[PDB]
């Protein structure tokens, strides 16, 4: 319900090679997954 | 509703590579699962 | 609702590689895994 | 109560790899697992 | 009021690898494993 | 030609699903791996 | 050297999933290193 | 010593699901290392 | 002492699921190490 | 006589589970380790 009126939170302040799934408010009741992998 | 306009704050960082999911207020019942590799 | 007239506060930040589910508030009834590896 | 007004508290700051499941104010009836392997 | 104090603060850091799953504060019933290996 | 000659060796053979990285006679010199997951 | 254009093998199948990386008998500086996983 | 011609195959017969990953002949100079895990 | 059999051979293989990770044949100055759980 | 004799010419299986991580052939200046573990 509550969402767009302000922000629950915040991540990230500045990096390099960094990646992630920002999602808040209200979550979904089901499944769920990622992967992710770098080298050097 | 769940969360009121109230303050809560979040900030995410890092040097080399950082990844990750943000879910913040109340989750609800389900499953979540993620994997992470690398080679150097 | 959970997390009643409040704020709280977390932060993360680390060096190499870093990976994980950040989540405030409290868990729910449901199922949560997650792995990593690395080579030096 | 359970938790309290401004800053909560923070997680991850520097080191060189750490993952995990963050969850703040109290854990409900479920199930959590991660393993986690490295070569030198 | 619960854990020690009203405000707070908390911070998650180490040496080598590290990996935790469950709540700050205190626990509740519930299950958690963790599992690590490595080759010098 | 040590590549053909007769049946060098041999499995199961046909599948619902595979992946992966064929190399066969000859390679890359270096460092090769990543990181794959699958629910189901 | 017995390595250029040399033998490998056969196999991987049946009626599932299957995922790897086989490489002719060539194994150069750091290689083949990283980590995998699923769910049913 | 090493396989200085004597044939050379390989083959891997499993059933749900099966990964791996290795050099067919001499491990030089370097280094490989893997990580699996799945939950029912 | 150095493999001795027609048709080389084969290596990997089972059922519910399996993992390995090292050079066949021979092994020369290196390291290598693996590691894998399941819940069930 | 050679060690533990099992991948090079032959197969490599078990039951329900295995795995297995290590130099093949003739231990040298090398090191080898792994681990895994399973709950219900």
Same mark, same amino acid.
Request: aromatic share 4%; hydrophobic share 45%; glycine share 16%.
């Given at each position: 319900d509550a969402e767009?009126?302000?922000d629950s939170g915040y991540e990230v302040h500045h990096q390099?090679?960094?990646f992630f799934?920002?999602?808040?408010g209200?979550?979904?009741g089901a %499944? %769920?997954?990622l992967?992710?992998?770098?080298v050097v």
């Open positions: 767009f009126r302000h390099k090679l960094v799934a920002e999602d808040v209200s979550n979904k %499944i %769920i997954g992967m992710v992998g770098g």
